[PDB]
Design a protein around this ligand. Structure first.
Ligand SMILES: COCCN1Cc2ccc(Cl)cc2[C@H](C(=O)Nc2cncc3ccccc23)C1
Ligand SMILES: [Cl-]
Lengths: 302, 298
């Protein structure tokens, strides 16, 4: 029993964190084999931030301008290339602690663990989700740039996020490990804003199935709904549209508990209408949307 | 910006998890130097009578794919200490510490000697933990990281009928009035960790949430009369002293923040949230708030 927001063990990722220094700027890098991946804005200075020409800034750099630190040992940079908004620093030593890894691009609603780092040193780990507005509600201070998000399904580390910036609302923007940003964001200090955020419907439904598996059935009702009538109601509460793919993905949880997806949808409809009325679901007074159907299956069963 | 339930990096602890098998039972062990620590119920009760019948070769210890050979065994309260032939090369700088209720820690939940997840939790005033554990999770450990030193504070033993968890410190002494036996046991009535809620209200202020603040103050005695009415733990002068740095950083006296908490308890949140929560959060200590709102590394 018990349902906690659970992060992956960070050990495999800690053994890859390095500190990257270019001039006055210091941030984190990911050392995998003989390459250190870090945000390309490490080469940017004071005025070179509203409209930086990264190709023009990088051509002025030599390998010895980049100081890379792995614990107390300094790594020697022997090459550099840019791939979108990531800088790839070729180093003269391959990381012996390199785990079995993959670079994956995630879709909104997917979850991942974050190893928050400062000066190449890991300070904490937490679980979070790619919001539908492509931002993450993380916990990051100055110097956390270059921190990474990951999942460790089986013995392999899937890197899915690298942190680049904080938006004026306090939420965070970053890229996949190939340097492509999530969302309409740019690694420029221009006026940017996160779009209106919505609730991840498929995730809330998965968390309601987790509550049923853990013995909580107070919110269930004798009603069902059509998928169309559910979406019309859900849109009014700023909930993401629920698709037929989401219904198919909730299939295993539906068969395990004996509650049809559209039956669970009717219960969510009623929760949105009534609120909780002094009650909680899995120790929460709000509807939790940062657990996917896969996360529920993983923690509630294996 | 941002305030998350943050666990310590588990790397140093992952390198210590092993699988312990005795007869039909399989659980986790903590391999530090040449000793593997695990719950004594792996041999299951008269534990002295059960242990005298076991030989070293009855305990199968697995470290990844490598098998460790047991060369001795002894009991220390409710922990079994299996002497092994090989010292763990991944042994970190460590200490065994006993924590007090209200103190927080990271839990590296494991199954079959393999770490599967890490989460943050607190020792409840009723000495239970609201964890997330399944069958096979026994022997999973709780820890804090202090500079480069890992302080092990918890070893999981059992789940109570309410779904909450009971375990011991690494010296085998249980937290709470629990016993390691299949019998009728219940967690006592739980209370809210007042000093922790106040620390989390200071974290909300640092993150720009000030709606709950007011012009009022209270006496420590008048606050404790109200707090006792709402199943909150008594707030002591030590708690007030510990909240000092957060009070000076935000400019809100502890008894001023206590007057805000009094109004939240009597009047509720009124459709509003604090740090994305509609309930008052009590599993962040004043030190957890300071460490996260300053970014200290390990
Ligand atoms: C206060 O001045 C911040 C200026 N930042 C402007 C900016 C613009 C584009 C890009 Cl890609 C990076 C940045 C930098 C940035 O977002 N850094 C930070 C990251 N993550 C949390 C941060 C919390 C606080 C501070 C800074 C954070 C620096
Ligand atoms: Cl995905």
């Amino acid at each position: 029993s018990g349902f906690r927001k659970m992060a992956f063990p960070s050990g495999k990722v800690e053994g890859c964190m390095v500190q990257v220094t270019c001039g006055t700027t210091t941030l984190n890098g990911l050392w995998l084999d003989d390459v250190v991946y870090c945000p390309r804005h490490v080469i940017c200075t004071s005025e070179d931030m509203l409209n930086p020409n990264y190709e023009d800034l990088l051509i002025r750099k030599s390998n010895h301008n980049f100081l890379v630190q792995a614990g107390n040992v300094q790594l020697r940079v022997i090459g550099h290339s840019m791939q979108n908004c990531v800088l790839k620093l070729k180093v003269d030593t391959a990381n012996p602690k390199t785990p079995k890894y993959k670079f994956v691009r995630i879709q909104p609603g997917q979850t991942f663990s974050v190893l928050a780092c400062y000066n190449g040193s890991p300070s904490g780990v937490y679980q979070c989700a790619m919001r539908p507005n492509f931002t993450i509600k993380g916990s990051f201070l100055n110097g956390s740039c270059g921190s990474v998000g990951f999942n460790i399904d089986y013995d392999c580390v899937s890197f899915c996020y690298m942190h680049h910036m904080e938006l004026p609302t306090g939420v965070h923007a970053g890229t996949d490990l190939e340097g492509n940003f999530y969302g309409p964001f740019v690694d420029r200090q221009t006026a940017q804003a996160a779009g209106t955020d919505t609730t991840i419907t498929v995730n809330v439904l998965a968390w309601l199935y987790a509550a049923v598996i853990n013995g909580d059935r107070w919110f269930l009702n004798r009603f069902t709904t059509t998928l169309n009538d559910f979406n019309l109601v859900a849109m009014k509460y700023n909930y993401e549209p629920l698709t037929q793919d989401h219904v198919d993905i909730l299939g295993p949880l539906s068969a395990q508990t004996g509650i049809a997806v559209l039956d669970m949808c009717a219960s969510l409809k009623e929760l949105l209408q009534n609120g909780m009325n002094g009650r909680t679901i899995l120790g929460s007074a709000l509807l939790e949307d940062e657990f996917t159907p896969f996360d529920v299956v993983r923690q509630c069963s294996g």
